[PDB]
Amino acid sequence: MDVNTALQEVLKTALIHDGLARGIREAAKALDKRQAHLCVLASNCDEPMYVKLVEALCAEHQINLIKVDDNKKLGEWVGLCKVVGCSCVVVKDYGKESQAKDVIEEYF
């Protein structure tokens, strides 16, 4: 039960329950709205202001953050599949509690 597998399962559940906000604009709106318990970041993105703003907003809202490696893999996980490639995700809510969610909380 690796943290990668836990993230994949929780993202799949959130998408199936429509609790996922993909993209930097949607993620920023969800974070500023005092919602969206968790956030996922991709280390592949080459834009420095991107990661700077993502981390600054996440820290200001005081919510968990995860830095995954590949933007394309993150997009394929969040369900943009040819994969567009998501470089920042937000979990507005989880559909149902699961062992993957528990593992993510423990990693937090």
Partner 1 sequence: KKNKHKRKKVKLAVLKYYKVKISRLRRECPSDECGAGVFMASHFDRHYCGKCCLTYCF
Residues that bind partner 1 (CB under 8 A): 24-25, 28-30, 32-34, 47, 49-50, 52-53, 56-57, 60
The residue among 10 and 74 lying less far from partner 1, judged by its C-beta, is: 74
For 48-98, what is the HEC assignment? HHHHHHHHHHHHHHCCEEEEECCHHHHHHHHCCCCCCCCCEEEECCCCCCC
Query: CA-CA distance, 64 to 108, in Å (whole number)?
Result: 7
CB of 106 to partner 1, least distance (A): 29
CB closer to partner 1, 3 vs 53: 53
Alpha-carbon distance of 31 to 98, in angstroms, equals: 23
In whole angstroms, the minimum distance from the beta carbon of 50 to partner 1 comes to 7
Residue closer to partner 1, measured from CB, 17 or 25: 25
CB atoms under 10 Å from CB of 43, counted, come to 12
Smallest distance from partner 1 to CB 27, Å = 9
